[PDB]
Ligand binder design. Structure first.
Ligand SMILES: Nc1ncnc2c1ncn2[C@@H]1O[C@H](COP(=O)(O)OP(=O)(O)OP(=O)(O)O)[C@@H](O)[C@H]1O
Ligand SMILES: O=C(O)/C=C(/CCc1ccc(Cl)cc1)c1ccc(-c2ccccc2)cc1
Length: 284
């Protein structure tokens, strides 16, 4: 087990409502890590322990190039530490906001990586439940690094569990089924995927309003529009993901999974193998 004095801390990378992520160098290796730190008193006081434990447990299960890797964990008398790969280029949302929207080649490439990641995650019987540009980081090579697994769910294989009951998510990306049926499924992530593709091309997510309730009302009514100029095959893909019936979204188990999704005409030119070894297109 590593200790805090095994590291030299540098700048703070960001701060959550009960966590701090700090850039750290390991003295014995000179390796860089992003260390997530929570105060035991705070999580003990604010009933956050199940989230801490969840994040650890879920990240321990992941072994794939498009996720933030968990390398190690430790604790002292005041804090819990999560040793993570450092995503040098930060959040995808930053780039969306900076350039306003992605061209077709970039939209295709980053959508393909997110599909690849979700194929992996769902293959392991895990639902993310809070997929959004803020939670998709970018490494030094500008490949994606999905994060934020404290609100993920490992579905039980023993019971062939399909639905998750905890109420979690972000209003702009939350699925109609969690709102109306009060449970989420793997396909709830595909709804988020549709929202993100939309956002990449249009510059904003499709259901938006100045408070959550209004957004909820738009979601359950499928109330949204495409801007006049939206890549047509991408619009078709979005219309196949933003479907109220969760059993009818392209990529869901009832539609026979990721095969048909990866075969969508929007991905015609994609080479799905060793995606993580291709040079990403420049966002420019
Ligand atoms: N592995 C990482 N590499 C680089 N930056 C990271 C990494 N992990 C997190 N960050 C950055 O640090 C910020 C804070 O992360 P953290 O998970 O502690 O809180 P959060 O999830 O943003 O906040 P909240 O809990 O309120 O949602 C993130 O928003 C992200 O921008
Ligand atoms: O690492 C270890 O060896 C052990 C643990 C479990 C120990 C533990 C003891 C008391 C409390 Cl209140 C919470 C966790 C641990 C440590 C860190 C995290 C962690 C998870 C997410 C963010 C930051 C830290 C989770 C469990």
């Amino acid at each position: 087990k590593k200790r805090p004095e095994d590291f030299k801390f540098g700048k703070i990378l960001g701060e959550g409502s009960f966590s701090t992520v700090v850039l750290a160098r390991e003295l014995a290796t000179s390796r860089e890590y992003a260390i997530k730190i929570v105060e035991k008193r705070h999580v003990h006081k604010e009933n956050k322990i199940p989230y801490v434990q969840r994040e650890k447990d879920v990240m321990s299960r992941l072994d794939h190039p498009f996720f933030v890797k968990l390398y190690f964990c430790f604790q002292d008398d005041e804090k819990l530490y999560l040793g993570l790969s450092y995503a040098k280029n930060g959040e995808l949302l930053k780039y969306i906001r900076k350039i306003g929207s992605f061209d077709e080649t970039c939209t295709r490439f980053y959508t393909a990586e997110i599909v690849s990641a979700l194929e992996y995650l769902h293959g392991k019987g895990i639902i993310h439940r809070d997929l959004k540009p803020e939670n998709i980081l970018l490494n030094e090579d500008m490949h994606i690094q999905i994060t934020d697994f404290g609100t993920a769910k490992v579905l039980s294989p023993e019971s062939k569990q399909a639905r998750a009951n905890s109420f979690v998510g972000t209003a702009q990306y939350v699925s109609p089924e969690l709102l109306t049926e009060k449970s989420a499924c793997k396909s709830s992530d595909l709804w988020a995927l549709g929202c993100i593709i939309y956002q990449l091309v249009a510059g904003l997510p499709p259901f938006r309003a100045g408070n959550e309730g209004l957004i909820f009302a738009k979601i359950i009514k499928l109330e949204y529009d495409f801007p006049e100029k939206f890549f047509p095959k991408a619009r078709d893909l979005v219309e196949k993901l933003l479907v109220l019936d969760a059993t009818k979204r392209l990529g869901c188990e009832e539609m026979e999974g990721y095969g048909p999704l990866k075969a969508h005409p929007f991905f015609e030119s994609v080479t799905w193998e060793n995606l993580h070894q291709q040079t990403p297109p420049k966002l420019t």
